[PDB]
Amino acid sequence: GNGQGRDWKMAIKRCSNVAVGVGGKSKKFGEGNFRWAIRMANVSTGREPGDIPETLDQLRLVICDLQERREKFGSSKEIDMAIVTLKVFAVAGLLNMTVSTAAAAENMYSQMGLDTRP
């Protein structure tokens, strides 16, 4: 499915209340940033451009693949933001759970046992 639905708008609005830094003040999540991430991550995974899923299974999977390639390629601000996005977004969307910070989101994603090490 592709388009802007209740789950879509809600996903962006939810993460919108998330801090993308060490301290929440004037740098929350935005729609533009989400795209640059979800997109950069999608294309980076050799996945078609029209890949707009909407399932916890899809998010967890996409995040897993990005993790493997993230290491083999090394740690980068670009690859990091992209991954942290798919996570904070997956939980803030598929789980409708608003996280305090992008870091806390990704941390819980892997800490919960979602981001395995394949």
Which method, experimentally, gave rise to this model? NMR
Nearest to 67 by CA among 28, 89, 59, 51: 59
For residue 72, what are the domain limits?
A: 1-118
Q: What 3-state class would DSSP assign to 44?
A: helix
CA 102 to each of CA 3, 22, 46, 64: distance values in angstroms, whole numbers, following the listed order: 24, 9, 24, 17
Instruction: Classify residue 85 by burial, with Cβ atoms within 10 Å: 0-12, 13-18, 19+.
Output: buried
What type of residue sits at position 22? V
Whether 73 contacts 55, CB under 8 Å: no
* Inter-axis angle of helices 31-44 and 56-73, nearest 10: 70
Instruction: Show the tokens assigned to 71.
Output: 């290491």
Indicate the number of domains in the chain: 1
Question: CA 64, CA 25: separation in Å to the nearest integer?
Answer: 30
Instruction: Show the tokens assigned to 53.
Output: 């899923």
